[PDB]
Amino acid sequence: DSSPAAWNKEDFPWSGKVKDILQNVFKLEKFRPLQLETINVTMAGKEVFLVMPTGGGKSLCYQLPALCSDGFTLVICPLISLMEDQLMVLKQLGISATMLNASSSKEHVKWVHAEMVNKNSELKLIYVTPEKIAKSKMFMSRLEKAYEARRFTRIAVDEVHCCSQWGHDFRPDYKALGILKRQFPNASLIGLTATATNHVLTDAQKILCIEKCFTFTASFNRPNLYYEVRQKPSNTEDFIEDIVKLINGRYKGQSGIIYCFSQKDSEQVTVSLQNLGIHAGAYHANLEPEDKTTVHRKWSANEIQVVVATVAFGMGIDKPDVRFVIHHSMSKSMENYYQESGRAGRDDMKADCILYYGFGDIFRISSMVVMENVGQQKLYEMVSYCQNISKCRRVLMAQHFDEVWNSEACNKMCDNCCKSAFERKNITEYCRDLIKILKQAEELNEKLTPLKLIDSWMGKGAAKLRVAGVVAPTLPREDLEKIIAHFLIQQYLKEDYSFTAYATISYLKIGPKANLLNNEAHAITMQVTK
Amino acid sequence: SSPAAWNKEDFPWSGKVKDILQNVFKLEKFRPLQLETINVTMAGKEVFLVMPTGGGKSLCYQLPALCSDGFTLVICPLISLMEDQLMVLKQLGISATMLNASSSKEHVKWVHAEMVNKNSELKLIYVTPEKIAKSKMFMSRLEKAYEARRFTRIAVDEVHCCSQWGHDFRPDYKALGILKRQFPNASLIGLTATATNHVLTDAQKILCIEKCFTFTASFNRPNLYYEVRQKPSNTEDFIEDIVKLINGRYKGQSGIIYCFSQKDSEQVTVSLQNLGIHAGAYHANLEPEDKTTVHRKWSANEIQVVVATVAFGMGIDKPDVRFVIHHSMSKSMENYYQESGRAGRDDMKADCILYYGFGDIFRISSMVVMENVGQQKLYEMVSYCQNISKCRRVLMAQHFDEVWNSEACNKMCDNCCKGSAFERKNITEYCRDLIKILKQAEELNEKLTPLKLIDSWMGKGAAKLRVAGVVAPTLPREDLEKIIAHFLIQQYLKEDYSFTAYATISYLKIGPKANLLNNEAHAITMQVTK
DNA sequence: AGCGTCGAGATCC
DNA sequence: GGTATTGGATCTCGACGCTCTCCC
DNA sequence: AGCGTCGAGATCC
DNA sequence: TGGATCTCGACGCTCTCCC
Ligand SMILES: [Zn+2]
Ligand SMILES: [Zn+2]
């Protein structure tokens, strides 16, 4: 509401008590960013929404005031697994916490009810799913009794973004949760989310029936992470060898994740690494749940060095010693790449995030996201991040997050910052040639895939598609691909999707801004290295 | 920028429209806004039509299908609505088909073959939004048909399903934008019975349309007679009033009695049957065969009265429903309008009679405690009930935000039929007495139900709950209940919900505006007759 | 656990 | 010398059945 | 319609 | 004057994840 900075203090009456617990129960010397501000706000009896990247320590901001308080804290969690994660951490720490779920043993629930009402119960955190609030009259009655007895005074709503349709995940159950603030007004409410917008947070505030809400957003920045973008090799076996050279080289004996675009990609990459002596395991949704759990367990135990995964991997990733995250293919958006890379270096020590940029991955992902209304837009933002050879990776991420950034805050931690040595290349004539090829194709009633267009540029492919006088520059194929990608994201070329029986395919067509080429003073410049 | 401009028949298609209408559909005239929507659609321009159920929505997209060359794609969330449209269209002889989740595989090949076929007589294809989202084959066949200029019309039923804030929310609808992106030259019509400004803007966003005509039909149904009656305290007396209605003015006429709860429907059905009425109970807990049998007996007029919860309402096309009686008030104005509007679909005169009971307020209030706006729409319904002067159509118009003329009702509601003859009564001292009773209860640590409050007011009930000097006025119990209801919806008294093992119950407590009584000049007035 | 209902048992006139 | 209901209403208590509520 | 191996098919030696 | 491996072309099931 006003500012998080006002709360980054320890002159509050409980502030000493906050600190005993921080160092004593939780055994942490210092507070992670925005943890102290959120905890102080909660202890002041003030509803707070905390947006914080996964692995930044969200759970602490509601777990610590629970031992600072008197009775128990009610946490609403959408999935049973997240509740199990928190419960495991808490049992290890020694805090008494319990969980109620849809099909829990009948007598576990009777015990939970008795503990809720109990006058001197040691139970400190109760985790429930949203239907326990929505549909269980007994649990609501016990919550009301506990509240009247001043043993229930804190509410934590995990995945608050689930209130809004505009959030990635939406749970209908969530539209009940407002009853909490209505039934227990003296209980302070905290909403926790990794990803949220102003619209999503305002929606959640509407659903939760909250009048005034502090809104604290943590920085995207992870200072220990080194961000790099490399050329994706044309040869798949050459790419696998480069990966093995990295793993046996910099990352010998170090755990890591390789993110892959497709399930077949994950399986093939895992097979290739296994045949080259790397202990790697594939993870994707089509795997059996037992197989998934086995792979996760072996990786966490370090029996498996590398987990080759799609976006399916992401269940409770708490591994702190992930030294490298490699993207075999680019993610579909800046959000996804940020979340996937951020699984590295949770221990706050140095870790590397290495991304492989390939021309064809753009169109794999574009055909893929054709159903998402903004899928092409976020994909093209990812593409622009990949195309950049001058700007700092942290600066681009900050633009993406609408976050205030300092140019010199990257501080040697990305590949562009460690290399001016670049120059500008005029590529207008390449655009005119490509448009000529496209026009020849459309007169012959031919649709051109990016491969057909680039081949016609290079003089290969079907002869009829070739244009007289069009000679490609003497550049590596990747340079021609980068030029075409720039024309695409700059809208001189556009994607035209076609739906066929087994697949969705991308064609390239004349873009909106191509008419600008009618004027010869028109110029198009791309940065290259010199 | 307004439909009246489109209320013409000088367009080139206007001849084809009217011939086809009178010939294929055998209807001489159009209901309001049908030709206008048809003209805008026929002008190849996406239009959103908000029109009440039973007003003839399906025709506005079915008629231009036969005016055009190839076929129209209709998007329908539920299979049942699709069956309804298919039976009407088959009876007329128009070839329309439906593809659904579990359709025969050979039905799918026949549908695909018809889609590609060049001279197919198929005019309307009904599919669910997942058919678009997940079927690569259906999209390929749609693209082939579209390129052949045989697929040029899209109808999206229940566009309000795009928004979470809509009455019904479907996640599948967020794929539907692909249609406009893949088939921009295909005209889109969106159909909905219920929508707000928020919902239409959300749906327009989701469907990726940046330009939309918006035609909203009037709520008004001139043939319907709207009445509100006092719900008798005695259940057997209430059943007698109903039998007097049914055997009297509605002898041999079909009708619906809407009930709050499923056993209420059951009790009322038993009572009507034992008194010689052919009545049938309808609620969600019935077996599907029972539902269809009851619907069939009612449609054949073998069952005169259908005693139903809100479950009845599926595809109600019975045109000769002469009376709809509300045994209990609906939970909202929206619901009461939809439930009453099933009467007089034949456009002949019909009656909507509502029975208002003090205890129904709290029955419904406890039921909707989980709905974030449930109490608010219930209280709006209550205010409609409390009114004894204003025209019912005016109250509905306020709910619908529709411009209305007071005298357009034309003797067609109970309040309009009594004509001033009303006056204002100052009831402030009653509020002070009730607040004293409430203060004594909260100091004695006692919770008061509305019945307990009325008993203390009347000098009955527990002696300890009574306040010295508080004597209730010599009025019928209904009048004290109405005074308390006025205090409640005016928020001088408030509901306090308590959750117990078997039920959620309402207490009455001092409301937010009670501090206003501190001014001694403060007055609270309720309208009465002289 | 709690509301709403209804006799028994007091008190009075 | 002492005086106030083989009754007739009335509080005024305390036990004692339901509770389970729409819609997908 | 599309990418990639793999036959078919040449002319030349 | 026969058949070489090296260019095409063909059309197959396609190659897209999980929220
Ligand atoms: Zn940098
Ligand atoms: Zn009227």
Side-chain angles (χ1 to χ4, degrees), chain A residues 27 42 53 88 259 336 384 404 422 436 445 469 514:
Chain A
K27 288 323 172 282
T42 278
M88 159 102 34
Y259 270 105
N336 282 19
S384 302
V404 173
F422 329 106
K436 291 176 68 70
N445 258 274

PDB file of all heavy atoms in Angstrom, chain A residues 27 42 53 88 259 336 384 404 422 436 445 469 514:
ATOM      1  N   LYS A  27      16.977 -21.898  12.326  1.00  0.00           N
ATOM      2  CA  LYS A  27      18.429 -21.918  12.138  1.00  0.00           C
ATOM      3  C   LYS A  27      18.846 -21.232  10.821  1.00  0.00           C
ATOM      4  O   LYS A  27      19.513 -21.828   9.975  1.00  0.00           O
ATOM      5  CB  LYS A  27      18.890 -23.371  12.135  1.00  0.00           C
ATOM      6  CG  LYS A  27      18.904 -24.198  13.466  1.00  0.00           C
ATOM      7  CD  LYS A  27      19.275 -23.577  14.797  1.00  0.00           C
ATOM      8  CE  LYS A  27      18.988 -24.615  15.898  1.00  0.00           C
ATOM      9  NZ  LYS A  27      17.537 -24.716  16.240  1.00  0.00           N
ATOM     10  N   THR A  42       2.581  -8.994   8.889  1.00  0.00           N
ATOM     11  CA  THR A  42       1.661  -9.978   9.435  1.00  0.00           C
ATOM     12  C   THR A  42       1.463  -9.783  10.936  1.00  0.00           C
ATOM     13  O   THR A  42       0.326  -9.765  11.418  1.00  0.00           O
ATOM     14  CB  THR A  42       2.170 -11.381   9.119  1.00  0.00           C
ATOM     15  OG1 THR A  42       1.789 -11.714   7.780  1.00  0.00           O
ATOM     16  CG2 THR A  42       1.544 -12.383  10.076  1.00  0.00           C
ATOM     17  N   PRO A  53       9.567 -15.095  -6.025  1.00  0.00           N
ATOM     18  CA  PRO A  53       9.933 -16.221  -6.889  1.00  0.00           C
ATOM     19  C   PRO A  53      10.052 -17.518  -6.102  1.00  0.00           C
ATOM     20  O   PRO A  53      10.375 -17.530  -4.911  1.00  0.00           O
ATOM     21  CB  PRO A  53      11.290 -15.798  -7.472  1.00  0.00           C
ATOM     22  CG  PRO A  53      11.313 -14.313  -7.338  1.00  0.00           C
ATOM     23  CD  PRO A  53      10.560 -13.999  -6.088  1.00  0.00           C
ATOM     24  N   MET A  88       6.793 -32.086   5.792  1.00  0.00           N
ATOM     25  CA  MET A  88       8.098 -32.785   5.934  1.00  0.00           C
ATOM     26  C   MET A  88       9.123 -31.799   6.485  1.00  0.00           C
ATOM     27  O   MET A  88       9.806 -32.135   7.459  1.00  0.00           O
ATOM     28  CB  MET A  88       8.594 -33.306   4.582  1.00  0.00           C
ATOM     29  CG  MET A  88      10.077 -33.562   4.523  1.00  0.00           C
ATOM     30  SD  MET A  88      10.457 -35.324   4.658  1.00  0.00           S
ATOM     31  CE  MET A  88       9.040 -36.025   3.817  1.00  0.00           C
ATOM     32  N   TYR A 259      16.527 -28.941 -19.628  1.00  0.00           N
ATOM     33  CA  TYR A 259      15.129 -28.763 -19.992  1.00  0.00           C
ATOM     34  C   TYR A 259      14.971 -28.975 -21.486  1.00  0.00           C
ATOM     35  O   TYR A 259      15.753 -28.449 -22.282  1.00  0.00           O
ATOM     36  CB  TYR A 259      14.626 -27.384 -19.582  1.00  0.00           C
ATOM     37  CG  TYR A 259      14.048 -27.388 -18.194  1.00  0.00           C
ATOM     38  CD1 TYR A 259      14.745 -26.842 -17.126  1.00  0.00           C
ATOM     39  CD2 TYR A 259      12.817 -27.977 -17.940  1.00  0.00           C
ATOM     40  CE1 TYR A 259      14.220 -26.856 -15.850  1.00  0.00           C
ATOM     41  CE2 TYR A 259      12.284 -27.995 -16.670  1.00  0.00           C
ATOM     42  CZ  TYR A 259      12.990 -27.436 -15.628  1.00  0.00           C
ATOM     43  OH  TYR A 259      12.463 -27.456 -14.355  1.00  0.00           O
ATOM     44  N   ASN A 336       8.525 -18.637 -18.303  1.00  0.00           N
ATOM     45  CA  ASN A 336       8.886 -20.037 -18.164  1.00  0.00           C
ATOM     46  C   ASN A 336      10.397 -20.159 -18.058  1.00  0.00           C
ATOM     47  O   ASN A 336      10.893 -20.946 -17.252  1.00  0.00           O
ATOM     48  CB  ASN A 336       8.355 -20.826 -19.351  1.00  0.00           C
ATOM     49  CG  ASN A 336       6.853 -21.131 -19.228  1.00  0.00           C
ATOM     50  OD1 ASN A 336       6.134 -20.480 -18.471  1.00  0.00           O
ATOM     51  ND2 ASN A 336       6.392 -22.178 -19.915  1.00  0.00           N
ATOM     52  N   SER A 384      13.515 -12.597 -28.899  1.00  0.00           N
ATOM     53  CA  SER A 384      14.295 -11.365 -28.848  1.00  0.00           C
ATOM     54  C   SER A 384      15.378 -11.453 -27.784  1.00  0.00           C
ATOM     55  O   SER A 384      16.506 -10.992 -27.995  1.00  0.00           O
ATOM     56  CB  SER A 384      13.381 -10.173 -28.578  1.00  0.00           C
ATOM     57  OG  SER A 384      12.377 -10.088 -29.573  1.00  0.00           O
ATOM     58  N   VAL A 404      12.522  -2.053 -11.766  1.00  0.00           N
ATOM     59  CA  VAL A 404      13.566  -1.042 -11.804  1.00  0.00           C
ATOM     60  C   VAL A 404      14.912  -1.729 -11.630  1.00  0.00           C
ATOM     61  O   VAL A 404      15.114  -2.491 -10.680  1.00  0.00           O
ATOM     62  CB  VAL A 404      13.317  -0.002 -10.696  1.00  0.00           C
ATOM     63  CG1 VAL A 404      14.452   0.975 -10.583  1.00  0.00           C
ATOM     64  CG2 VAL A 404      11.999   0.725 -10.893  1.00  0.00           C
ATOM     65  N   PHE A 422      30.947  -5.005 -30.993  1.00  0.00           N
ATOM     66  CA  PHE A 422      29.812  -5.240 -31.872  1.00  0.00           C
ATOM     67  C   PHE A 422      29.697  -4.079 -32.855  1.00  0.00           C
ATOM     68  O   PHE A 422      30.371  -3.052 -32.720  1.00  0.00           O
ATOM     69  CB  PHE A 422      28.496  -5.402 -31.088  1.00  0.00           C
ATOM     70  CG  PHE A 422      28.643  -6.008 -29.706  1.00  0.00           C
ATOM     71  CD1 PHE A 422      28.533  -5.222 -28.569  1.00  0.00           C
ATOM     72  CD2 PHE A 422      28.845  -7.376 -29.550  1.00  0.00           C
ATOM     73  CE1 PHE A 422      28.647  -5.778 -27.300  1.00  0.00           C
ATOM     74  CE2 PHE A 422      28.957  -7.937 -28.283  1.00  0.00           C
ATOM     75  CZ  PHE A 422      28.859  -7.139 -27.160  1.00  0.00           C
ATOM     76  N   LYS A 436      10.893 -11.004 -52.476  1.00  0.00           N
ATOM     77  CA  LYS A 436      10.808 -11.482 -53.855  1.00  0.00           C
ATOM     78  C   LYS A 436      10.581 -12.990 -53.908  1.00  0.00           C
ATOM     79  O   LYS A 436       9.785 -13.480 -54.721  1.00  0.00           O
ATOM     80  CB  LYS A 436      12.065 -11.104 -54.638  1.00  0.00           C
ATOM     81  CG  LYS A 436      12.224  -9.620 -54.912  1.00  0.00           C
ATOM     82  CD  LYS A 436      13.546  -9.337 -55.607  1.00  0.00           C
ATOM     83  CE  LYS A 436      13.572  -9.896 -57.023  1.00  0.00           C
ATOM     84  NZ  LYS A 436      12.672  -9.160 -57.953  1.00  0.00           N
ATOM     85  N   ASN A 445       1.299 -20.391 -56.295  1.00  0.00           N
ATOM     86  CA  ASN A 445       0.397 -20.989 -55.307  1.00  0.00           C
ATOM     87  C   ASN A 445       1.130 -22.006 -54.427  1.00  0.00           C
ATOM     88  O   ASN A 445       0.695 -23.145 -54.251  1.00  0.00           O
ATOM     89  CB  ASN A 445      -0.824 -21.611 -55.985  1.00  0.00           C
ATOM     90  CG  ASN A 445      -2.064 -20.739 -55.870  1.00  0.00           C
ATOM     91  OD1 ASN A 445      -2.791 -20.808 -54.875  1.00  0.00           O
ATOM     92  ND2 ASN A 445      -2.301 -19.907 -56.872  1.00  0.00           N
ATOM     93  N   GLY A 469      18.813 -13.811 -59.608  1.00  0.00           N
ATOM     94  CA  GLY A 469      19.553 -12.696 -59.063  1.00  0.00           C
ATOM     95  C   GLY A 469      19.642 -12.645 -57.553  1.00  0.00           C
ATOM     96  O   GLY A 469      20.386 -11.811 -57.021  1.00  0.00           O
ATOM     97  N   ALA A 514       6.171  -4.766 -44.469  1.00  0.00           N
ATOM     98  CA  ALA A 514       6.886  -4.943 -45.729  1.00  0.00           C
ATOM     99  C   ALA A 514       6.599  -3.813 -46.708  1.00  0.00           C
ATOM    100  O   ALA A 514       7.455  -3.484 -47.540  1.00  0.00           O
ATOM    101  CB  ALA A 514       6.504  -6.286 -46.355  1.00  0.00           C
TER     102      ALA A 514
END
